[PDB]
Amino acid sequence: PAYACQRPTPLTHHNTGLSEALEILAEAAGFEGSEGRLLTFCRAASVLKALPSPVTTLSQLQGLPHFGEHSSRVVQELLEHGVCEEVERVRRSERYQTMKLFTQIFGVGVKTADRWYREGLRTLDDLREQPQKLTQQQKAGLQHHQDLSTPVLRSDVDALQQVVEEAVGQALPGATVTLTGGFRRGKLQGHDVDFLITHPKEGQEAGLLPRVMCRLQDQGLILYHQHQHSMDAFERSFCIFRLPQPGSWKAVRVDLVVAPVSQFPFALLGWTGSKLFQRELRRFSRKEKGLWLNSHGLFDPEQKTFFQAASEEDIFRHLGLEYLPPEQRNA
DNA sequence: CGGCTTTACG
DNA sequence: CGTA
DNA sequence: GCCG
Ligand SMILES: Nc1nc2c(ncn2[C@H]2C[C@H](O)[C@@H](COP(=O)(O)NP(=O)(O)OP(=O)(O)O)O2)c(=O)[nH]1
Ligand SMILES: [K+]
Ligand SMILES: [Mg+2]
Ligand SMILES: [Mg+2]
Ligand SMILES: [Mg+2]
């Protein structure tokens, strides 16, 4: 199928080297402001992730969506020689390495990274030498960069889920906490931990994060937090937690999002990802079904009505798609 | 060409 | 501009 | 970069 939401995409697969190479080119395209090329290379990579066995010959690419001349050439060289010269050229280029370093800082996007690169900056120390030019978010991302570069593990997730569950339960009787993001899709490692919070009585979830954050801050667990007030915007908090470790601690990015229970299935679907799965699903909804999907709902612009969903299964059914559990959304 | 997910908040 |  |  042409859309990633039409096919199961497991976390581990049979074309790891080929997908890795295409995702290098996708990332590099993004660094150069070519978001169309990034999307195609990402889609091509995801098609290989969905295949039931390894690609060993070029003919297997015939008929595969999103494989044109460029993506096919990359696979051809990897099959024939074990490397793709274009990919290796990107890997060792100063532009790619610096843009990857900068864009992985919390608070730095492609545009900021590119400006810093054009200004001649190249290292984290170059950034630190002019703290007056950094936002508070970027200061926090640099302050904690080493820890934030360290993979978050399942044991960290379990520990953070307990402290968030404890704080949410202290802030609002009856509130629930659901692990979302990459760990819900079965990832064993990740860049952060994402939690979705709700309450079974519509409206009772309002005003929750300030209470949650105060209780976390009084335990000394919050190194950074950025709160966004709240339906078409959820209350959200992008945090850096201080996570205890044997004899020490490490900083961990944690995202908290609160949804009213009426919108919980849409929030869970959106925050579970993957990012490409989400994009593909929303593209499918609009272009194939004429319905507008976001993290709050599913809108019929002809009838001018929102679909009330009680589950992710409801949403897949309303879109005419076979249900995919989170572990098969690893597009 | 025209499109490419989503979009309020800080 | 940045954040999911 | 690929699709229509
Ligand atoms: N609308 C929108 N949703 C996004 C975007 N990026 C991600 N999402 C959605 C889809 C994402 O799955 C979800 C959580 O975002 P992460 O925590 O940044 N990523 P994940 O947990 O998958 O992996 P890891 O943390 O290990 O890097 O938010 C975006 O630019 N826009
Ligand atoms: K970043
Ligand atoms: Mg173009
Ligand atoms: Mg995450
Ligand atoms: Mg996150």
- CA dihedral over A143, A225, A111, A24, signed as positive or negative: positive
- CA dihedral over A41, A43, A48, A49, signed as positive or negative: positive
Q: Residue A179 C-alpha to ligand 3 middle, in angstroms?
A: 38
Phi and psi angles of residue A6, each rounded to the nearest 5 degrees, phi first: -95, 0
Find, among A206, A194, A211, the residue nearest to A230 by Cα. A206
Find, among A89, A85, A86, A109, the residue nearest to A97 by Cα. A89
- Going by their DSSP bridges, the two strands A248-258 and A192-198 should be labelled as parallel
| Strand B atom within 7 Å of A294 CB | yes
Q: Which nucleotide is nearest to A66 (CA to C1')?
A: D2
Report which ligand 1 atom has the smallest distance to the Cα of A182.
21
Give me A5's structure tokens: 């939401």
With H, G, I as helix, E, B as strand and everything else as coil, classify residue A120: coil
Nucleotides of strand D lying closer than 7 angstroms to a protein CB: 1-4
Whose tokens are 């801050």? That residue is: A217
Find, among A178, A238, A192, A194, the residue nearest to A213 by Cα. A238
Contact by Cβ (8 Å): A22, A44: yes
∠ CA A326-A329-A331, rounded to 5°: 155
Contact by Cβ (8 Å): A2, A65: yes
Find, among A236, A243, A272, A228, the residue nearest to A144 by Cα. A243
Q: How far is CA A161 from the centre of its chain?
A: 18
Phi and psi angles of residue A295, each rounded to the nearest 5 degrees, phi first: -75, 0
Which residue's CA is the closest to the ligand 1 atom numbered 31?
A275
Q: How far is CA A20 from the centre of its chain?
A: 17
Question: Helices A69-81 and A85-92 sit at what angle, rounded to 10 degrees?
Answer: 90
Technique that determined the structure: X-ray
Contact by Cβ (8 Å): A26, A66: no
A192 is catalytic: yes
- CA dihedral over A287, A290, A292, A293, signed as positive or negative: negative
Contact by Cβ (8 Å): A175, A209: no
Find, among A37, A18, A17, the residue nearest to A27 by Cα. A37
Neighbour-count burial of A133, counting CB atoms closer than 10 A to its CB (0-12 exposed, 13-18 middle, 19+ buried): exposed
Give me A236's structure tokens: 């959200």
Neighbour-count burial of A142, counting CB atoms closer than 10 A to its CB (0-12 exposed, 13-18 middle, 19+ buried): buried
Question: What is the distance between the alpha carbons of residues A219 and A213, in angstroms, rounded to a whole number?
Answer: 10
Catalytic residue among A192, A218, A232, A300: A192
Q: Which nucleotide is nearest to A71 (CA to C1')?
A: D1
Find, among A198, A227, A211, A207, the residue nearest to A170 by Cα. A211
Q: How many CA atoms lie within 13 A of A92 on its CB side?
A: 5
